[PDB]
Ligand binder design. Structure first.
Ligand SMILES: O=P(O)(O)OC[C@@H](O)[C@@H](O)[C@H](O)[C@H](O)COP(=O)(O)O
Ligand SMILES: [Ca+2]
Ligand SMILES: [Ca+2]
Ligand SMILES: [Ca+2]
Ligand SMILES: [Ca+2]
Lengths: 326, 324
């Protein structure tokens, strides 16, 4: 897969530093209330969620290549980001119907790729839940949906970042040993599908192809995999796309994520960055409520910075430039 | 633009800049017509067959045919060599329990897939009340932006059909709706002529209910001929895009007389996408007498309908190759 228009390339560059994506993300649009819900008794507010987002944006984007935000609540935050940091806006509705197994994708009702571009984004991000082994008609609908979005992004000449989260229709918990044994299959086969030209993806945002918590040396409990087997999953992942791809952090600590990046590189993965945030800013939330907005600012300038700086130093030794895939 | 490929497709759908197209993407509407002439529920085979019969028999006389991907792909493959293809992209009908009538693409289709199925155009039907809920219309506008963008990327003409309604008026055949129809139609056209929606051709209602116009009415008269004519001129002043009329199932003769009246009034419309005014009578014949009787109906009454329409189009429609 080898194409970038002049504008898509300029946008990718705005999202990167020396071909590496070190992008700052937020978690959901409801998750933040709960981290706040620890105290007071209020749910406060639309006014305040937009604020902490603006504090995290303003203080930490100077050290990130870009920031990913939600349009429904993140636009104020997007306007206070560093001038040297690019912007991705999410296009999907969050969550899924737990009562069914289909997890069908659905774009935000009053958004379009055109509107995302008009709001100043350098990329459209869309999250798809995909079970390669799932219902074939469900997956046809999902493929059709991504084709439309890839087409929109082609027309608006804006990079398409497709996030894939894998699951199994018949496995309740994706942290389970049961899901771990098939994760490589789910992750890598999904990448093969959505690497096809017809879906118009510019960058894949994906899980590491193994639950490192069950790998020898990284596991606290039961061991399902040797380091050699885990490494093979990373090489298989590298072989599953020619597109740039970046890793999301899921279910692991900042330290284990960083150890995973080192292990990915060692194994032969040519990942081109990461898109994580929660670990980087999560601590600012309590401080925000125990000492106020100015103190959260202080947290971000010191602890927040230390977090993202640590990560960047790791990225500097492990990530590969996406320019090498062009 | 038109881009090279969009222009080539528009040419395949047209003759000398005029779209003389046959519409048969009916699904829910076709079901209700067949439901009048039998107690049994219409099957898949009967819907596919009637569509193929109309396609095979009448597309020699049309510049193109509009079919639906659900039942119409076999019909699409037996169309005349000289006729282009449009495929419908929207799910049929709307929710009668609410007033929003929100649009929804067919679940396993995309503009890319429509192009791959051999269409020279994507057709999408939007129900629109210009005076309706502001948030509903915002959602509608965003949806059309997405389709227009898909069609730009796949480099395939976007035909947007607009059917108007009023959230608080149950029956769009009523005098009450007639009195506001010109507003509904012409202001909707003006919105969806905005560049951001990527429309190449508007498929629209005539901006008057001609059954209430002086000289055409058989009962109550709501409008003089001069008032009706002015509604056509306002329609022409609402867009510089190519636009074509749908027949809305009036008689072949009223539709024909309406086109004459439109041209006389100053409407520079670029053709039609006409279905029921042409083949409506074939449904009962197919159900009650079977496919052979339907062919013969199509070869006589159907031909007669479409032939008389084409003659009227020849002396009323304006070429879109002026609007480019
Ligand atoms: O509700 P359904 O089953 O989806 O049918 C609607 C569809 O047929 C219309 O959009 C016609 O294409 C259009 O009005 C031109 O057809 P005529 O009005 O000229 O017959
Ligand atoms: Ca930069
Ligand atoms: Ca314009
Ligand atoms: Ca005009
Ligand atoms: Ca003439």
């Amino acid at each position: 897969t080898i194409t970038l228009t002049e504008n898509k390339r300029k946008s990718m560059e705005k999202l990167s530093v020396d071909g590496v994506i070190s992008a700052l993300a937020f978690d959901q649009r409801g998750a933040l209330k709960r981290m706040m819900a620890q105290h007071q008794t209020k749910e406060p507010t639309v006014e305040q969620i937009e604020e902490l987002k603006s504090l995290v944006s303003e203080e930490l984007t100077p050290f990130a290549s870009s920031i990913l935000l939600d349009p429904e609540y993140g636009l104020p935050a997007s306007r206070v980001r560093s001038e040297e940091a690019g912007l991705l806006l999410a296009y999907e509705k969050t969550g899924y119907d737990a009562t069914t197994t289909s997890r069908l994708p659905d774009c935000l009702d009053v958004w379009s790729a055109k509107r995302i571009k008009e709001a100043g984004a350098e990329a459209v991000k869309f999250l798809l839940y995909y079970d390669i082994d799932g219902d074939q008609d469900v997956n046809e609908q999902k493929k059709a949906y991504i084709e439309r979005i890839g087409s929109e992004c082609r027309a608006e000449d804006i990079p398409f970042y497709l996030e894939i989260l894998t699951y199994d229709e018949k496995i309740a918990d994706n942290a389970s040993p049961e899901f771990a044994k098939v994760k490589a299959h789910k992750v890598n086969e999904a990448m093969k599908v959505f690497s096809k030209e017809r879906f118009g993806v510019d960058v894949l945002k994906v899980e590491v192809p193994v639950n490192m918590k069950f790998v020898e040396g990284f596991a606290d409990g039961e061991v399902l995999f040797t380091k050699e087997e885990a490494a093979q999953a990373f090489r298989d992942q590298e072989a599953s796309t020619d597109l740039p791809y970046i890793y999301l952090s899921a279910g692991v600590s900042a330290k284990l994520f960083q150890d995973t990046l080192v292990f990915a590189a060692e194994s032969g993965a040519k990942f081109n960055g990461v898109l994580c945030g929660r670990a980087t800013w999560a601590g600012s939330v309590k401080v925000y409520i125990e000492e106020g907005p100015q103190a959260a600012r202080e947290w971000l300038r010191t602890e927040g910075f230390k977090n993202i700086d640590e990560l960047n130093k790791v990225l500097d030794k492990t990530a590969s430039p996406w320019t090498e895939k062009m």
